[PDB]
Amino acid sequence: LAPITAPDITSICKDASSGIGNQEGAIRTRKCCPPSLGKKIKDFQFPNDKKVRMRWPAHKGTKKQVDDYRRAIAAMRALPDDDPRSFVSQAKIHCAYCNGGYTQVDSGFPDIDIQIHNSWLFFPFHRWYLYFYERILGSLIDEPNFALPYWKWDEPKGMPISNIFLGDASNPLYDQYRDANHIEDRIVDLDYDGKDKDIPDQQQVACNLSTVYRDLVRNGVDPTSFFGGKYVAGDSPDPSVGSVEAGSHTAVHRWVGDPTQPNNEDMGNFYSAGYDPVFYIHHANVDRMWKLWKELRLPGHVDITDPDWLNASYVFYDENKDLVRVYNKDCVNLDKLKYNFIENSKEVFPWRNSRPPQRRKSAQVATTGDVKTVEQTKFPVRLNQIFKVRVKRPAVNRTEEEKDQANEVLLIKKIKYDSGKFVKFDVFVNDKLKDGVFTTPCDPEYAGGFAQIPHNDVMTSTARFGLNELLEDTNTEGEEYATVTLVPRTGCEDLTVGEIKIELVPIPK
Numbered sequence: 001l002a003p004i005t006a007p008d009i010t011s012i013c014k015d016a017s018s019g020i021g022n023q024e025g026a027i028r029t030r031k032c033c034p035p036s037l038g039k040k041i042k043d044f045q046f047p048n049d050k051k052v053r054m055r056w057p058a059h060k061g062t063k064k065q066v067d068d069y070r071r072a073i074a075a076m077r078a079l080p081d082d083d084p085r086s087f088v089s090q091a092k093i094h095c096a097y098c099n100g101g102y103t104q105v106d107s108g109f110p111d112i113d114i115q116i117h118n119s120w121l122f123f124p125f126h127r128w129y130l131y132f133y134e135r136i137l138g139s140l141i142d143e144p145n146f147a148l149p150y151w152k153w154d155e156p157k158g159m160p161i162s163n164i165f166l167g168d169a170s171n172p173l174y175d176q177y178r179d180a181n182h183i184e185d186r187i188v189d190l191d192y193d194g195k196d197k198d199i200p201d202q203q204q205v206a207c208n209l210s211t212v213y214r215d216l217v218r219n220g221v222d223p224t225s226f227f228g229g230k231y232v233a234g235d236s237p238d239p240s241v242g243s244v245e246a247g248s249h250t251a252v253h254r255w256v257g258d259p260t261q262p263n264n265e266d267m268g269n270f271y272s273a274g275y276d277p278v279f280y281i282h283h284a285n286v287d288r289m290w291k292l293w294k295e296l297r298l299p300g301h302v303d304i305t306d307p308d309w310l311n312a313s314y315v316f317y318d319e320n321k322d323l324v325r326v327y328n329k330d331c332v333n334l335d336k337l338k339y340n341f342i343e344n345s346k347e348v349f350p351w352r353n354s355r356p357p358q359r360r361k362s363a364q365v366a367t368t369g370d371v372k373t374v375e376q377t378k379f380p381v382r383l384n385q386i387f388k389v390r391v392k393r394p395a396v397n398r399t400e401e402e403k404d405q406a407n408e409v410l411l412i413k414k415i416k417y418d419s420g421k422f423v424k425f426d427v428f429v430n431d432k433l434k435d436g437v438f439t440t441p442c443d444p445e446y447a448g449g450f451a452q453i454p455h456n457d458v459m460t461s462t463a464r465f466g467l468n469e470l471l472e473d474t475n476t477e478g479e480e481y482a483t484v485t486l487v488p489r490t491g492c493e494d495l496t497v498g499e500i501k502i503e504l505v506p507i508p509k
């Protein structure tokens with residue numbers, strides 16, 4: 001067993017040096033280390049809160065919920081910087097853990113950094129991060145039952161940035177370093193690639209709902225595909241990045257960050273994202289997606305039970321300025337963490353049925369055209385342009401019972417690129433429409449994207465796309481090969497793909 005283990009973050013820490021493409025021009029500090037107060041690290045104890053903290057949609061808060069949240073951020077902003085509870089200290093936590101603050105010295109690897117992103121540590125780390133953040137905010141205003149808002153971008157009216165975050169600096173929830181084009185009641189683009197789409201609001205809303213369905217159902221088919229790939233001590237730069245992390249979560253980061261800043265600060269980069277209050281509220285909904293993913297009660301939607309994940313741990317300051325070590329295993333049950341999320345109390349999530357519409361055969365031509373197979377192709381391949389290839393399937397016309405027991409999964413492995421820049425490419429499968437056919441940004445042929453916030457230690461990544469639905473949706477369940485189109489969107493000039501294949505992945509019970 002070799003679980004990732006944060007060191008004494010007050011003894012072992014160094015300025016952030018990873019994932020920041022323009023350090024010279026950086027708007028925020030790279031000195032992201034937490035203050036040293038001489039505290040001894042204590043083990044986590046489950047909270048004894050009387051009530052469950054009920055996190056609320058940021059666009060539908062009561063006057064008290066908004067005022068308390070505003071009042072708490074104000075108090076946090078007033079704290080001396082060196083206070084571990086301060087506005088700046090809380091932002092630096094993200095920078096320390098995401099941009100090279102710590103090493104794996106406690107595991108016996110002092111020359112390897114810890115990265116909690118692009119791995120199965122993604123969800124539980126941010127869960128713990130927010131747990132303490134919330135409890136700190138509550139303490140500052142003496143509200144024992146204080147709860148964060150969440151950015152419900154899975155709800156149409158929750159998709160624009162809530163107006164509680166807007167205005168000027170007289171509003172504590174305001175951040176000047178945001179994309180000026182995206183703060184004027186504009187609808188978030190959950191599959192943003194750095195350029196505004198020119199599409200009707202109704203269509204952006206519909207595709208956003210399809211993005212949530214894609215991240216949580218179409219591609220989030222099991223723990224590996226949803227949480228991200230296995231990451232243990234000794235592992236130096238990926239593992240595979242999860243569906244939410246490389247999907248809606250990354251899109252929102254780049255959508256909010258100010259593209260006129262050198263690293264698209266604040267939200268556009270891990271090192272600066274925490275200086276925007278909306279960052280935590282975005283991640284509050286990401287945290288909620290883990291809960292929703294379980295609540296779907298679909299096969300494969302189970303929590304990780306690998307000891308190497310369960311026993312991984314981080315260290316945070318709490319509201320008492322004590323150092324607390326927390327483990328992944330202790331954050332899986334929200335009841336025990338004494339918070340949850342106000343839900344709609346309706347039959348269904350608004351995105352629950354946003355599976356792309358079935359492609360009509362009348363809209364398709366016979367074949368995907370003249371295209372070579374993976375075996376006829378020389379890898380690696382460069383994505384300086386669109387790349388198409390036929391991938392051998394492990395089987396054709398699988399039964400519902402077989403599809404119920406294993407996901408057919410497209411693997412794009414050995415994705416090599418400079419990660420000093422934001423990267424995105426899109427993936428389409430069995431695209432073969434007749435000329436003239438109406439298309440949208442969320443057609444059934446669209447498998448999703450690979451999107452990566454900068455995290456240069458070149459870097460090597462892996463993406464996993466679910467095909468059980470898509471092959472049905474494109475009428476290609478009987479075809480021996482599946483035709484894969486990779487479409488570069490940004491940062492792919494130097495990017496290389498080393499392996500492409502399709503596998504049957506048994507659904508874990």
Ligand SMILES: [Cu+2]
Pocket residue numbers: 249253283
């Ligand atoms: Cu994030």
Ligand SMILES: [Cu+2]
Pocket residue numbers: 094098117126270
């Ligand atoms: Cu993060």
Ligand SMILES: [O]
Pocket residue numbers: 117
């Ligand atoms: O993140």
Ligand SMILES: [O]
Pocket residue numbers: 094270273
């Ligand atoms: O993040």
Ligand SMILES: [W+6]
Pocket residue numbers: 199200201
């Ligand atoms: W319009």
